[PDB]
Amino acid sequence: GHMIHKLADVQSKNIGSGTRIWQFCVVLPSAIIGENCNICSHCFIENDVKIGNNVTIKCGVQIWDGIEIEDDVFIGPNVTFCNDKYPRSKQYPKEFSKTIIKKGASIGANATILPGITIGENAMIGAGAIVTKDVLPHVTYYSKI
Amino acid sequence: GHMIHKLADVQSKNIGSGTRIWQFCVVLPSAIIGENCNICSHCFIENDVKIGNNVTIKCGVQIWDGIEIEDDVFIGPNVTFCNDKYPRSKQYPKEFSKTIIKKGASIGANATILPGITIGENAMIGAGAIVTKDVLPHVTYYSKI
Amino acid sequence: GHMIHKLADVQSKNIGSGTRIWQFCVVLPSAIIGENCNICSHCFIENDVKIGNNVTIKCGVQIWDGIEIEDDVFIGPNVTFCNDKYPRSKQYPKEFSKTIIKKGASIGANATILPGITIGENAMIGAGAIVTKDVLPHVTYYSKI
Ligand SMILES: CC(C)(COP(=O)(O)OP(=O)(O)OC[C@H]1O[C@@H](n2cnc3c(N)ncnc32)[C@H](O)[C@@H]1OP(=O)(O)O)[C@@H](O)C(=O)NCCC(=O)NCCSO
Ligand SMILES: CC(C)(COP(=O)(O)OP(=O)(O)OC[C@H]1O[C@@H](n2cnc3c(N)ncnc32)[C@H](O)[C@@H]1OP(=O)(O)O)[C@@H](O)C(=O)NCCC(=O)NCCSO
Ligand SMILES: CC(C)(COP(=O)(O)OP(=O)(O)OC[C@H]1O[C@@H](n2cnc3c(N)ncnc32)[C@H](O)[C@@H]1OP(=O)(O)O)[C@@H](O)C(=O)NCCC(=O)NCCSO
Ligand SMILES: Cc1cn([C@H]2C[C@H](O)[C@@H](COP(=O)(O)OP(=O)(O)O[C@H]3O[C@H](C)[C@H](O)[C@H](N)[C@H]3O)O2)c(=O)[nH]c1=O
Ligand SMILES: Cc1cn([C@H]2C[C@H](O)[C@@H](COP(=O)(O)OP(=O)(O)O[C@H]3O[C@H](C)[C@H](O)[C@H](N)[C@H]3O)O2)c(=O)[nH]c1=O
Ligand SMILES: Cc1cn([C@H]2C[C@H](O)[C@@H](COP(=O)(O)OP(=O)(O)O[C@H]3O[C@H](C)[C@H](O)[C@H](N)[C@H]3O)O2)c(=O)[nH]c1=O
Ligand code: NA
């Protein structure tokens, strides 16, 4: 079985064994979440979303339509994703931009991931980074101060 | 009518037709929100706040006292606003700094807007930007990496 | 007495007189919170956490195991902290990195604080800053654009 906190609103049945979903999360019906994930408090997970096994999503993260997270990924707290490069209110894209975070990658706290991005296997994104270009597998990327 | 999610705490009656306010939002009594807005999950909206029509506020945003959002504005997820330039705990300003986000402007995901800022009509703020100065109408501004 | 909002999940008994904890907060059992604090909506506070007196934590902040906040500190909205410098999903550190935010310091909105950091007494961290090194007492630090 999986653990859905009574204070979460989880509408998806597609949740793997061992997964924990914590307080004040929203998970919409078509989301797919694998086994042994930890979806920490205050997250939002939309419909066209696939999350693999052993994924950690720390607090305050939103996973939009068009985003896939592979197995063993770590997403730091308050990490932000995008599916629309030129957002204008009520101007809905015909197709959302896709992001994929590949197996074992880690995204540091409060990073910002632009739309259409691939982050390669086992990459490490520094805390607070702005990722405007793909990050190669196993690369450590951060936004220099 | 408007749609207030049962899992929101909306204390304002000043909400326009067609507006949606989603799970785990807090809206304090004096907030004014126009028609056909979408206030996504996990937002906080204070009292001295005016939000126009057709405004999109993505998840995880707080709109403080002193902030006005005009019509047709898009605010990306985890965008942060300020009303106090030199904050010190329990040192309450006599007057909060005012921010105005003008008609049709868009603010990218996880941007940070300093206090006292004007963002001009139809401007575009890049994801993750720090906005320390006014942005002119129709300008695209981002914080270079 | 202290004020715990009915829409918060506060599991700690260690909360000082005059403290307010707002909607959609999570506070785990071992957290220590002093007197006259304001823990604004949408915060998460873990177990190995000490927060002093007269502390303001604005919305959307998480205080992890290993973090101490001294008296009279201001933490801006969506400020992010870290306790793991090289995070990998399911690779639990033997010991979390410690952060201390010293008396009277202020952290601007949407700043990112790396693990192992000391922010000195009465320092001021600019909105959106990435703090990768200790900040001396009374220093104003921001990430230049
Ligand atoms: C990116 C990194 C892995 C790099 O660590 P590192 O490779 O040991 O680098 P380092 O020796 O500390 O720093 C090298 C330089 O890069 C800078 N730097 C490191 N991380 C940075 C970041 N996130 N943003 C900007 N600059 C950074 C340092 O200031 C240092 O600069 P100088 O050489 O000018 O002194 C780490 O700093 C980091 O950001 N970790 C993520 C932490 C996190 O977000 N954890 C999740 C939340 S807690 O689970
Ligand atoms: C700012 C922008 C509109 C610019 O798009 P663009 O004008 O097509 O620029 P571009 O050709 O991709 O990039 C030009 C340069 O600016 C850099 N850049 C673009 N956006 C940036 C940003 N947000 N921060 C820092 N640098 C950025 C690029 O890296 C590129 O650098 P080089 O010239 O060195 O390669 C877009 O990148 C962006 O930030 N969009 C907002 C996305 C968002 O937040 N959506 C809301 C959430 S999903 O609804
Ligand atoms: C850091 C600061 C205290 C500095 O204020 P200041 O010392 O009056 O500086 P200033 O005169 O406005 O700016 C000096 C320069 O630093 C830049 N700057 C100021 N704050 C900055 C920031 N946060 N990030 C990047 N650059 C910044 C300005 O753009 C200006 O650049 P130029 O000299 O190139 O014009 C303030 O800008 C700030 O960030 N305050 C925190 C606001 C906040 O987060 N409040 C909490 C939420 S509301 O309670
Ligand atoms: C009990 C409880 C836990 N949680 C979430 C947030 C907690 O940090 C987390 C604890 O689960 P866990 O020990 O499996 O931790 P993880 O989420 O796996 O993260 C820790 O380990 C990582 C490797 C990194 O080091 C990270 N910085 C740590 O926080 O679960 C809630 O959101 N609400 C809760 O009520
Ligand atoms: C069903 C539901 C929706 N919502 C919010 C978050 C959802 O992303 C949003 C869906 O409403 P909508 O289709 O009107 O979307 P908008 O909020 O208008 O945003 C989309 O369109 C923009 C133009 C940009 O492209 C943006 N990146 C998109 O997400 O409503 C909740 O917060 N809780 C919910 O339970
Ligand atoms: C009524 C209510 C308040 N709150 C929180 C968020 C509100 O901004 C805050 C109001 O309490 P307060 O007046 O003691 O304000 P503080 O949290 O102390 O912050 C203000 O004063 C600072 C010095 C800075 O200038 C800051 N930018 C201001 O917001 O309490 C909730 O989260 N939910 C609520 O329902
Ligand atoms: Na943020």
Written as one string, the DSSP assignment of C38-66 is: EE-TT-EE-SSEEE-SS-EE-TT-EE-TT
Per-residue b or e along A76-113, where b marks 16 or more CB atoms closer than 10 Å to that residue's CB: bbbbbbbbbeebbbeeeeeebbebbbbbbbbbbbbbbb
Token couple for A62: 């939103």
**C36 at the B interface (CB within 8 A)?**
yes
The DSSP secondary-structure symbol of C92 reads: -
Do residues A82 and A88 make contact, with C-beta atoms less than 8 angstroms apart?
no
Residues with Cβ within 8 Å of residue A80, at least 6 apart in sequence:
A61, A62, A110, A111, A112, A113, B76, B77, B78, B109, B110, B127, B128
Q: Could you tell me if the CB of A22 is within 6 A of ligand 4?
A: yes
Tokens at residue A88, please?
Answer: 């204008």
| Distance between Cα C37 and ligand 5 center (Å) | 34
Q: Is A51 an 8 Å CB contact of chain B?
A: no
Distance CA A8, CA A107 (A): 24
Q: C97 CA distance to ligand 1 centroid (A)?
A: 14
CB of A143 within 8 Å of a chain B CB? The answer is yes
B contacts of A144 (beta carbons < 8 Å): 145
Name the 3-class secondary structure at A10: strand
* Alpha carbons B5 and B28: distance in angstroms, whole number: 15
The answer to whether B82 and C108 are in contact (CB under 8 A) is: yes
Contact criterion met (CB below 8 Å) for B65 and A101 = no
Chain A residues with CB-CB distance to B36 below 8 A: 90
Task: List the end-to-end C-alpha distance of chain A, in Å, as a whole number.
Answer: 45
Q: How many CB atoms lie under 10 A from the CB of residue C98?
A: 15
- Chain C contacts of A145, Cβ < 8 Å? 130, 132, 143-144
Tell me how far apart the alpha carbons of residues C109 and C92 are, in angstroms, rounded to a whole number.
29
Residue from the list B26, B80, B89 with its beta carbon closest to the beta carbon of C73: B89
Q: Report the alpha-carbon distance of residue B20 to residue C80 in Å, rounded.
A: 28
Residues C74 and B89: their CA atoms lie apart, in Å, by: 5
- Name the minimum distance, in Å, from the CA of A78 to any CA of chain C: 7
Q: How far C93 CA sits from the closest chain B CA (Å)?
A: 28
The structural architecture, per CATH, of the domain A1-145 is 3 Solenoid (2.160)
- Which amino acid makes up residue C7? L
Torsion of CA A34, C11, C53, A127, to 10 degrees: 0
E strand intervals along C17-131: 20-21, 26-27, 32-33, 38-39, 44-45, 49-51, 56-57, 62-63, 67-69, 74-75, 80-81, 99-101, 106-107, 112-113, 118-119, 124-125, 130-131
User: What is the token pair recorded at B70?
Assistant: 């005009």
Nearest to B127 among A42, A89, A114 (CB): A114
Q: What ligand 3 atom has the least distance to the C-alpha of B132?
A: 29
Task: Provide the CB-side half-sphere exposure for B44 (13 A, CA).
Answer: 23
Instruction: Report the C-alpha gap between C29 and C42 in whole angstroms.
Output: 17
Q: Name residue C38's beta-bridge partners.
A: C20, C56
Query: What is the token pair recorded at C10?
Result: 């506060």
Task: Give the integer Cα–Cα distance in Å for C122 and B32.
Answer: 36
Residues 6+ apart with CB under 8 A from C88: A72, A74, A104, A106
Ligand nearest to the CA of B93: 6
Q: Please tell me the distance from the alpha carbon of residue C112 to that of residue A85, in angstroms, as a whole number.
A: 24
Place of tokens 């942060």: B80
Quickly list DSSP for A60-106.
T-EE-TTEEE-TT-EE-TT-EE-S-SS--TT---SSPPPEEE-TT-E
What are the beta bridge partners of residue C26? Answer: C9, C44
**Which class for C133: exposed (0-12), middle (13-18), buried (19 or more C-beta within 10 A)?**
exposed
Which tokens sit at B48?
Answer: 């001295």
Q: How many CB atoms lie within 10 A of CB B6?
A: 6
d(Cα A22, Cα A10) in Å, to the nearest integer?
10
Chains in touch with B (3+ beta-carbon pairs under 8 Å) read: A, C
Q: Which amino acid is at A123?
A: A
| CA distance linking residue C127 with residue C136, whole number of Å | 17
Contact C2, C21 (CB under 8 A): yes
Cβ–Cβ contacts within 10 Å for residue A3, how many?
12
* Torsion region of A134: left, alpha or beta (phi above 0 gives left; psi -120 to 50 gives alpha): beta
In sequence order, the β-bridge partners of residue B74 are B56, B106
Label residues C71-86 b or e (16+ Cβ within 10 Å = b). bbbbbbbbbbbbbbee
The verdict on a CB contact (< 8 Å) between B24 and C23 is: yes
Q: CA–CA separation, C56 vs B21, rounded Å?
A: 27
Q: Which two tokens stand for residue C56?
A: 């303001």
- Are B67 and B75 a contacting pair, CB within 8 Å? no
Answer for the pair A104, A73: CB distance below 8 angstroms, yes or no. Answer: yes
Strand order in the sheet with B49-51: B32-33, B49-51, B67-69, B99-101, B118-119
Residue with token string 């201001």? C74
C59 C-alpha to ligand 1 centroid (Å): 25
C55 lies within 8 A of chain B by CB: yes
Give the long-range contacts of residues C95-99, CB within 8 A, separation 24 or more. C96/C48, C96/C64, C96/C65, C96/C66, C97/C66, C98/C66, C98/C67, C98/C68, C99/C66, C99/C67, C99/C68
